[PDB]
Design a protein around this ligand. Sequence first.
Ligand code: BCL
Ligand code: BCL
Ligand SMILES: CC[C@H]1c2cc3[nH]c4c(c3C)C(=O)[C@H](C(=O)OC)c4c3nc(cc4[nH]c(cc(n2)[C@@H]1C)c(C(C)=O)c4C)[C@@H](C)[C@@H]3CCC(=O)OC/C=C(\C)CCC[C@H](C)CCC[C@H](C)CCCC(C)C
Ligand SMILES: CC[C@H]1c2cc3[nH]c4c(c3C)C(=O)[C@H](C(=O)OC)c4c3nc(cc4[nH]c(cc(n2)[C@@H]1C)c(C(C)=O)c4C)[C@@H](C)[C@@H]3CCC(=O)OC/C=C(\C)CCC[C@H](C)CCC[C@H](C)CCCC(C)C
Ligand SMILES: COC(C)(C)C(=O)C/C=C(\C)CC/C=C(\C)CC/C=C(\C)CCCC/C(C)=C/CC[C@H](C)CC/C=C(\C)CCC=C(C)C
Ligand SMILES: CCCCCCCCCCCC[N+](C)(C)[O-]
Ligand SMILES: CCCCCCCCCCCC[N+](C)(C)[O-]
Ligand SMILES: CCCCCCCCCCCC[N+](C)(C)[O-]
Ligand SMILES: CCCCCCCCCCCC[N+](C)(C)[O-]
Ligand SMILES: CCCCCCCCCCCC[N+](C)(C)[O-]
Ligand SMILES: CCCCCCCCCCCC[N+](C)(C)[O-]
Ligand SMILES: [Fe+3]
Ligand SMILES: [K+]
Lengths: 302, 240, 281
Amino acid sequence: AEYQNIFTQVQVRGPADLGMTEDVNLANRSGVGPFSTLLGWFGNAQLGPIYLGSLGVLSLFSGLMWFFTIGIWFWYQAGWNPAVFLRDLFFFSLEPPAPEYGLSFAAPLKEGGLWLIASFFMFVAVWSWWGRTYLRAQALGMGKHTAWAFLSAIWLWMVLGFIRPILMGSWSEAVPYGIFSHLDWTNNFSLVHGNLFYNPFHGLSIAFLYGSALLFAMHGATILAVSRFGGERELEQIADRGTAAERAALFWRWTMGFNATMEGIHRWAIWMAVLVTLTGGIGILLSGTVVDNWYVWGQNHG
Amino acid sequence: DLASLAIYSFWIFLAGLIYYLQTENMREGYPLENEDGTPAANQGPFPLPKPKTFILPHGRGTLTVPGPESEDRPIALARTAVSEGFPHAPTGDPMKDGVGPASWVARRDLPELDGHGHNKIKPMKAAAGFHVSAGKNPIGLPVRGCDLEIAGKVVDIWVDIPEQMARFLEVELKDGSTRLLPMQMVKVQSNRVHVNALSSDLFAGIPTIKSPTEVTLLEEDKICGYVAGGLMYAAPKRKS
Amino acid sequence: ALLSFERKYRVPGGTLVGGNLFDFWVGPFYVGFFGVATFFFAALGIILIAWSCVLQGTWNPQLCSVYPPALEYGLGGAPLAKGGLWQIITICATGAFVSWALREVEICRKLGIGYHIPFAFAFAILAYLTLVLFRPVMMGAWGYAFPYGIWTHLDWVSNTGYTYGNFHYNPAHMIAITFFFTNALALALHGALVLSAANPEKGKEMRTPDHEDTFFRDLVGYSIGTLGIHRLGLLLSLSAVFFSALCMIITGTIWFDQWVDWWQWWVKLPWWANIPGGING
Ligand code: BCL
Ligand code: BCL
Ligand SMILES: CC[C@H]1c2cc3[nH]c4c(c3C)C(=O)[C@H](C(=O)OC)c4c3nc(cc4[nH]c(cc(n2)[C@@H]1C)c(C(C)=O)c4C)[C@@H](C)[C@@H]3CCC(=O)OC/C=C(\C)CCC[C@H](C)CCC[C@H](C)CCCC(C)C
Ligand SMILES: CC[C@H]1c2cc3[nH]c4c(c3C)C(=O)[C@H](C(=O)OC)c4c3nc(cc4[nH]c(cc(n2)[C@@H]1C)c(C(C)=O)c4C)[C@@H](C)[C@@H]3CCC(=O)OC/C=C(\C)CCC[C@H](C)CCC[C@H](C)CCCC(C)C
Ligand SMILES: COC(C)(C)C(=O)C/C=C(\C)CC/C=C(\C)CC/C=C(\C)CCCC/C(C)=C/CC[C@H](C)CC/C=C(\C)CCC=C(C)C
Ligand SMILES: CCCCCCCCCCCC[N+](C)(C)[O-]
Ligand SMILES: CCCCCCCCCCCC[N+](C)(C)[O-]
Ligand SMILES: CCCCCCCCCCCC[N+](C)(C)[O-]
Ligand SMILES: CCCCCCCCCCCC[N+](C)(C)[O-]
Ligand SMILES: CCCCCCCCCCCC[N+](C)(C)[O-]
Ligand SMILES: CCCCCCCCCCCC[N+](C)(C)[O-]
Ligand SMILES: [Fe+3]
Ligand SMILES: [K+]
C-alpha cells in the first residue's frame, strides 16, 4: 500500500499558535481553544483563537436573533410540544407577508411581521459579517479578495430576499424560513416562470457550479499529487517555483494542451466559484421583473 | 429587451475574463521554447502579460514575472530522434543527475521562513514543545526499502512549526550519516517505516543537507525529486 | 514547443501498455497508447454523432440529438436510427473517458507524481455510467438513459425528476446538493485566501501561510490548514458526485414513488405519530 496523503499518519503538536499580529487589535482576540486530535487527521488540530470585536458581536448577535425568532415560531407551531417540534421540524415555516400588505410593515406579527423581524436580524447579521471579512484582511495587510468573493454570494441572497421582492412590489415574493418550505418555494418559482432551464443565467450558474466541482477536484487532486514535493505550500512556490509547481503545470499541459501557474490557478478558482452566484442572481432578478416566462422568452431570443 | 442585452453583454465579459486569466497564467514558463531553448516560432494567440513584481518578506528581495526564464543548472539529457517531440534519454544516472521524475529545480539555497522570520522547518529535538500527539511515533523504527532490506533507523521527525505537521523523517544509515525522506513518501507501520520508492542501496544516494538543523528550498527539491524519481528508476529492484 | 522548464521532464518511460511505441508528444499533448485509444473512441463517436444528425436530418447544435432506444426495445440492440447509434456513441464515450483516464495515469508515472487526478476523474466517469449504464440496466431499458443533446438532455432531467414529484425530496439528492454548495464555498474562500496573501495592500510584503491561518482563525475561529483545504476541496467535490450517483441509482429501483412521501417514516414514528399539534398531528 502506497501512502496517498489523504489522512495524516503522525500528528505533532507544539505550543498554541496565536497568529500574526500586524495591525490587528490584540485586545479583541480570544484565547486558544481546545486541540482536536480528531480534526488533525484531515486538517489542523488547533481551534481558536477567534477575533471578536464590536462588529463581530453585532453580527454574532443578530444571527442568533434571526435563528431564535424563527425558532420561537417553530416552537409555537409545535404547540410547545417538544415531541411535535422534533417530528414536524422540517415542516415548520416562518412565512413572509401576504401580497395584500405589499412592501409595507403593517402585516400582523403572526402573519408576516415575524418574518420581517427575523429578516431584519439576518440583514444585519450578514452585512456586519461582511464588514468582518474586510476589516480582518485590512488588519493583516492582506488583500480584500475574501470580501469581494463573499459579496458575490451576498448578491444572490440579496436578490432573493430583498431586491426582487421590492422590485416586484411585495414581501410575499421573498423566501420563507424553513427546510421544506424553502425547497417548495424554489420548485415553485421555477414553475411560475416557465421552467428555469430556459433561463440562460440558470444554465450558466449551473455550469459554474459543476465547474467548481471539476476544478476543485482537479486542483485538490493535483496539489495532493505533488505534495511529495512540498506542493501544498503554494505561496512560497509562487515566490520561487519548485519541481512541485513544474510537474503540476506539466500534468495538465501534457493532458489538455495548456496549464496554469501556482498563482494563476487561484484566479481561475476565485472566479469559477464567484460566477456561480453572480450569474445566479441575475437570472432571478430578471425573473418576473423583466421576463415572465423563460420558455416564451427563449422562443423570441435564441 | 433587457434580458437579452444582459446575456449578450455577459458573454463578452466572459471572453475578456478568459483572456485575462489565461495571460495571468503565462507569468511563468513563457515564452515557449524549442527543444534547444531557442524562442519558439509559434507562441500561440495569447500575449505575455505586463510584468508584476512580488515583494518577498524578510528582505529576501523580489520576484518579477514574467521575466527572463533560465533553468540555471545543467540538464543531462540528449535527443532520441531526429525531429521535435520525442523523449530525451538521460546521459548518466538520471537519479544522480536530477533529470526525469528525479528532477529538481534551482530554488533559492536558503530555507523558507515563518512569518516571524524563523526557519519554517526544524527537527523536533530542536523545536521546543513539539512532540508526536496522535498515531504511531515513527522515531526509532527501522526504515525498509522497496527491495525489502533495512536501510536505516528513524532518528527524528522534521516538523513544520507554523503549520505543525510532519514534513520529513530523518533516517540514520549504516555509515552513521542521515538523510531526510519526505513524509508523504513513507508508510509508517507499527513495526517499521516502509519506503516503496527507494531500494536500500539507493538510500545513500539521497542528496544530503549542509546544516544539521535546517534545510533549504534547494535541498528540499533535490531530496524530494530524488526519492520520487526512485519510483520509476528503482523499479528493477522493487519486489512484489 | 516546450515550457522554459519542460525538457528535463520529457524522459522516456512510465507507459502502461506497448513500451516506447507511442511514447512521444504531439505539440504539448503527450500521446501514449491511451492517447491513441482516446482519439479513436472520441473520433469515431463524434463522427457517428454528426452522421446520426442526418438520420435525424438536423445539422444545428441547438437541435442535433441522439436519443436512446425506445423503452420497448428493453435492453437489446436497435436499428441505428431507432437507438442503435446512441448505443454505439455510448460505448465510444466510455472508451474515450476510460482512455483519457489511463492516459492520465501514464502522465502521472512519467512525472513521479501521485495518481490522485485520474482517481478524482473516476468519480465523474462513474456518475456518467450510473446514468447511462448502471441505472438503465437495473430498470431494464436503455430508454431510461438520457439523450445526447444540448437541450434535450435538459428535458430528460426535468422529465425524470418530476416522475418522483419535486425531486428535492430525495434524501441523497439533498446531500449531494449540500456538498456542491460547500464546494463552491470552499473554492471561493480558498482562491481568495491564497490570492489576498500573494497580492496584499499596496507596497506590502507578501503575506505568509501564517497570515492565512491568522486570517481565518481571526474570522471563524478555526483554520483548516494549507494541506487540509486541498484535502477538503477534493473530498467535498468527490463526495458531491458520489451522492449524485447514489441519489439517482436508488431512484427508480429501491424507491420509485413520490420522494416527498419517503419522509413519513419519521413523522409516523410511533412515540409521537398521533400526538396532536403541529402540521402533521
Ligand atoms: C425544480 C426547481 C428548479 C430550480 C430552481 C431554482 C431557483 C428558483 C434558483 C435556483 C438556483 C440555482 N440552481 Mg436551479 N432549479 C432546478 C434545477 C437545478 C439543477 C438540476 C440538476 O436540475 C441544478 C444543478 C441546479 C443548480 C442551481 C445552482 C447553480 C443555483 C444556485 C447557486 C448557489 O449556490 O446558490 C446557493 C447560494 C446562496 C443561496 C447564497 C446564500 C448567501 C448568504 C449570504 C449565506 C447566508 C447564510 C446565513 C447567514 C446562515 C448561516 C449558517 C450558519 C453558519 C450555520 N438547479 C429546477 C429547474 N434553482 C438559483 C439561481 O441563481 O437561479 C438562477 C435560484 O435562486
Ligand atoms: C426537474 C429538476 C429536478 C432535479 C432532478 C435531477 C435529476 C433527474 C438528476 C439530478 C442530478 C443532480 N442534481 Mg437535481 N433536480 C432538481 C433540483 C436541483 C437543484 C436545485 C437548486 O433545485 C440543484 C442544486 C440540483 C443538483 C443536482 C446534483 C446533485 C446532480 C448534478 C451533478 C451530477 O450529477 O454530476 C455528475 C456529473 C457527470 C455525470 C458528468 C460526467 C462527465 C464525463 C465523465 C466526461 C464528459 C466529457 C465531455 C463530453 C467533454 C467534451 C469535450 C471537451 C470539452 C474538449 N438539483 C429538480 C428538483 N437532479 C443528477 C444526478 O445526480 O446524476 C448522477 C440527475 O441525473
Ligand atoms: C461563491 C459563492 C459561494 C459562497 C461564498 C462565500 N460564502 C461566504 C464567504 C464566501 C466567499 C464569506 O466570506 C463568508 C464566510 O465567512 O465564510 C467562512 C460566507 C458565508 N457563507 C455562509 C453560508 C452559506 N454560503 C452559501 C453559499 C456560497 N457562499 C456559494 C456557493 C450557502 C448556501 C445556501 O449554499 C450558505 C448556507 C456562512 C458560513 C458565511 C456568512 C456568515 C454570516 O452572514 O454570518 C452572520 C450570522 C451569524 C454570525 C450568526 C448566525 C446564526 C447561525 C444559525 C448559527 C447559530 C445557531 C446554532 C448554535 C447552530 C446552527 C446550525 C445547525 C446545527 C442548527
Ligand atoms: C468528479 C468531480 C468532478 C469532475 C472531475 C474531473 N473531470 C475531469 C477530470 C477530473 C478530476 C480530469 O482529469 C479531466 C480533465 O481533463 O479535466 C480538465 C476531466 C474532464 N471532465 C470533463 C467534463 C465534465 N466534467 C464534469 C463534472 C465533474 N468532473 C465532476 C463534478 C461535467 C459536468 C456535467 O458537470 C463535465 C461536462 C472534460 C473537460 C474532461 C474529460 C476529457 C475527456 O474525457 O476527453 C476524452 C473525450 C473526448 C475529447 C470527446 C469524446 C466525445 C464522445 C466520444 C462522444 C460524446 C459523448 C457524450 C456522452 C455526449 C454528451 C452530450 C451533452 C450535450 C449532454
Ligand atoms: C431548539 O429550539 C430553539 C428555540 C433553541 C431554536 O433556536 C430553534 C431554532 C430553529 C428551529 C431554527 C432553524 C432554522 C431554519 C429552518 C431557517 C432556515 C433558513 C433558510 C432555509 C434560508 C432561506 C433563504 C432566506 C433568504 C433568501 C433570505 C433573504 C434575507 C433578506 C436578504 C433580508 C432582507 C431584509 C428584510 C426583508 C427586512 C427589511 C428591513 C430592513 C431595515 C432592511
Ligand atoms: C467553524 C469552527 C468554529 C470554531 C470556533 C472556536 C472558537 C474558539 C474560542 C475559544 C476560547 C478560548 N478561551 C479560553 C478564551 O475561552
Ligand atoms: C472536516 C474534518 C474531517 C475529520 C475526519 C476525521 C477522520 C478520521 C480518519 C483518521 C484515520 C485514522 N488512521 C488510523 C487511519 O489514521
Ligand atoms: C428590530 C426590528 C426593527 C424594526 C423593523 C421590523 C418591522 C416589523 C414590523 C412589525 C409589525 C408590528 N405590527 C403591530 C404592525 O404588526
Ligand atoms: C471561468 C471558466 C469559464 C467556463 C465557462 C463555462 C461555459 C458554459 C456555457 C454553457 C452554455 C449555457 N447556456 C446558458 C448558454 O445555455
Ligand atoms: C469551453 C468549453 C469547450 C472548450 C474546448 C477545449 C478547449 C481546447 C483547449 C486545448 C488547447 C490546446 N492547444 C491548442 C492550446 O494546444
Ligand atoms: C473553459 C476553460 C478553458 C478555456 C481555454 C483557454 C485557452 C487555453 C489555451 C491557452 C493557449 C496554450 N498555449 C498556446 C499558450 O500554449
Ligand atoms: Fe491551492
Ligand atoms: K521538542
